[PDB]
Design a protein around this ligand. Structure first.
Ligand SMILES: O=C1NC=C(F)[C@H](O)N1
Ligand SMILES: O=C1NC=C(F)[C@H](O)N1
Ligand SMILES: [Fe+3]
Ligand SMILES: [Fe+3]
Lengths: 423, 423
């Protein structure tokens, strides 16, 4: 029955703070002028950093843990990945999807992630994975608020009954409408697919998250239609453009023109560093492009951008432990957001910016909000990122739902010495 | 009460000529076999060059003289320019627009310009600048025939009530319908905006002048729609594509295909050398492209192309004295039209070709035409351009409306010597 979080550091704030908890919510936040004593019912942050929970804005829980089944993606490309997934999709069973999704979700809970948006392939007349995921959503609710995107992986207009299946998925309860314009057979189908996606989102009052321009094609500009339709409907807050890796290859003049619309539209952007560095640049010899969208410029322009893990051991990515600080680490390097302040503020890319992408209404350390927060054994964002620290405690509804007793490293010199990699 | 212009040289003609004037018109033109004596009622061209008036086919009189108000365009780009202008547009007043427009118009009269096409931003519900410019048009009529383009600077489909405001501007009397497809939110809005522009021009029997592809984007090809719609409606003579700077970046194969249509369509092209060299190439590091449309190739293909000043001390250009020979000088250098004949024929780019762009019906030194002409103290186009000569006399309706007493330079060597920079 926790009543207070004491000795907490907060990003962008000086000193220590006390967070009072009442009835599963944050009742008040007060600055401390020194270190407070521990006591029963008090969770001691020990001058560590307290932040709202990590968020996973983009993952594929229906494909997670399937890498190599029945075959491996040899080329390491998005296109072969979809082909390898199609082979696995034909072998799906309800229980298998639930088991694999739950395996990755447990890693996420352990990693302080309390909000997850999973795409689920609905280019499947049986909607096997979707039915399984809707059950997982209910089962995992005490620990993670899971959003499900009805993702038409093989296209809306380019797959048999694609539009009907996408709508069926919404009627079954999917929270977000997906699309993949660059995978449609033609540019015209791509644009038309977006009009259909927006019409469905307005008909059912759902969010939108488009796999948008995930291709090293300087002519893949579906993002301008996503932003324009959102602006026209006055619904930018409910819309997300995932990937936009083609933007890495656009000329600068078009990008500058486009940025005005991106800002005016208010839509969100998701970059997936671990997967993008792996799948993009595969058609270059040397030099080889990085292939991540224009994260640095978006931040400078005040456009909301955040980071997702995208895949965890599946056709598009052979690694991962569903760790957001690891995703952030890769993104900061590839996007060259390596200034001290840029690294320190990096936490926003896996917390607040992602919460905005998911249109969350109860997020942040503020009075009145649910007591959902995590404690990192680090002094600030820079320190947490540099040392790739685990989540010491994850609190949800005012209760501890995960904890990590840190590793203990000792070197035996003339005398034993504890090493914590700090300075 | 001038009755004759004597000792006149004419471009492309040998010898001297006499131009007889009667009732404000040119009654006859006769060759001379020698130098004629001066006499009362005779304006002596003194073997200088006589040409129809200079023309300014593209200028923004509503923004002229506002550079730095309230802020400067730091990046030197078209996009920031529009943003800086938006800030100034919110501060417009009727009298301020009239005063600034008249300041630049007086410089134009002094520079022998008797025909001017000004764009006026109509992405403004108050249409403040347009109302002011319609009054200026009437006031300046004795000296300059001013055409007003209803220019939807912030887009037709991408600005609130953009189409209604564009039509309102035509109902108030604007002479030309404008558009800016590359600034619309999407390629589809760009193309649609052109269909709407042409429909308005046919509904009101007005000319068209599109700010077309003014961007270093090799995919900005709105010019093909402008030309195709003009060809379909059989109205090329009434249509102009301004800038087309993207053409500088097109691959050669597409450009060759496009050129057939450009020629067949009969539309006009305006290049704005002083502004284009400044605003284009801003997204390149090194090498840096010039960014002017394909003027040399247009001339070789018989496509009508001409030069405008575009801006005089405003968001898009911090310099200028509204001097067409200076605009021509820049264009010849950047477009590499540096052969003797190319330079000598350069005057066509600021006289006859521009008159065609404005669809002028009374222009040129020919019997029956109004006696509107200017006298340059130079032997030919090459000489006028090299020495950047002023306009000795500007005649309109058979009367002198401007004159420049040339500067007198002397060097004091062993004896004083007059220097005129001639050879
Ligand atoms: O279309 C896609 N499917 C799965 C992925 F992991 C990648 O995000 N893109
Ligand atoms: O769109 C534009 N507005 C103003 C200029 F000077 C430039 O011609 N382009
Ligand atoms: Fe994905
Ligand atoms: Fe212009």
């Amino acid at each position: 029955a926790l009543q207070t979080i004491i000795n907490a550091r907060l990003p962008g704030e000086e000193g220590l703070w006390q967070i009072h908890l009442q009835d599963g919510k944050i009742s008040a936040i007060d600055a401390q002028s020194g270190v407070m004593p521990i006591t029963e019912n008090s969770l001691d942050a020990e001058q560590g950093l307290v932040i709202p929970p990590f968020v996973e804005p983009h993952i594929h829980l229906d494909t997670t843990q399937t890498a190599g089944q029945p075959n491996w993606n040899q080329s390491g490309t998005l296109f072969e990945g979809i082909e390898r997934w199609a082979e696995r999709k034909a072998l799906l069973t309800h229980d298998d999807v639930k088991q694999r999704a739950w395996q990755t979700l447990k890693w996420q809970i352990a990693n302080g992630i309390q909000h997850v948006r999973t795409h689920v392939d609905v280019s499947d007349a049986t909607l096997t994975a979707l039915k399984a995921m809707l059950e997982v959503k209910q089962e995992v609710a005490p620990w993670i608020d899971l959003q499900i995107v009805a993702f038409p992986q093989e296209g809306i207009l380019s797959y048999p009954n694609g539009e009907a299946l996408l709508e069926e998925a919404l009627r079954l309860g999917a929270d977000v409408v997906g699309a993949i314009p660059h995978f449609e057979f033609t540019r015209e189908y791509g644009v038309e697919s977006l009009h259909k996606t927006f019409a469905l989102a307005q008909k059912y009052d759902r969010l939108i998250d488009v796999h948008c321009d995930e291709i090293d094609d300087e002519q893949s500009r579906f993002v301008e239609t996503v932003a324009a339709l959102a602006h026209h409907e006055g619904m930018g807050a409910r819309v997300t453009a995932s990937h936009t890796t083609a933007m890495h290859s656009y000329n600068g003049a078009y990008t500058s023109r486009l940025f005005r619309l991106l800002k005016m539209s208010g839509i969100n952007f998701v970059a997936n560093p671990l997967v993008n560095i792996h799948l993009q640049g595969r058609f270059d010899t040397y030099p080889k492009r990085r292939g991540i969208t224009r994260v640095k410029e978006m931040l400078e322009s005040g456009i909301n951008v955040c980071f997702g893990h995208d895949a965890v051991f599946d056709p598009w990515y052979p690694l991962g432990t569903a760790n957001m600080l690891q995703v952030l680490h890769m993104g900061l390097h590839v996007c060259q957001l390596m200034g001290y302040g840029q690294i320190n503020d990096g936490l926003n890319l896996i917390t607040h910016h992602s919460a905005r992408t998911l249109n969350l209404q109860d997020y942040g350390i503020a009075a009145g909000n649910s007591a959902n927060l995590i404690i990192l054994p680090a002094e600030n964002g820079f320190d947490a990122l540099r040392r790739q620290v685990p989540v010491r405690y994850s609190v949800r509804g005012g209760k501890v739902i995960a904890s990590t007793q840190p590793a203990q490293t000792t070197v035996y010199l003339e005398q034993p010495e504890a090493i914590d990699y700090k300075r």
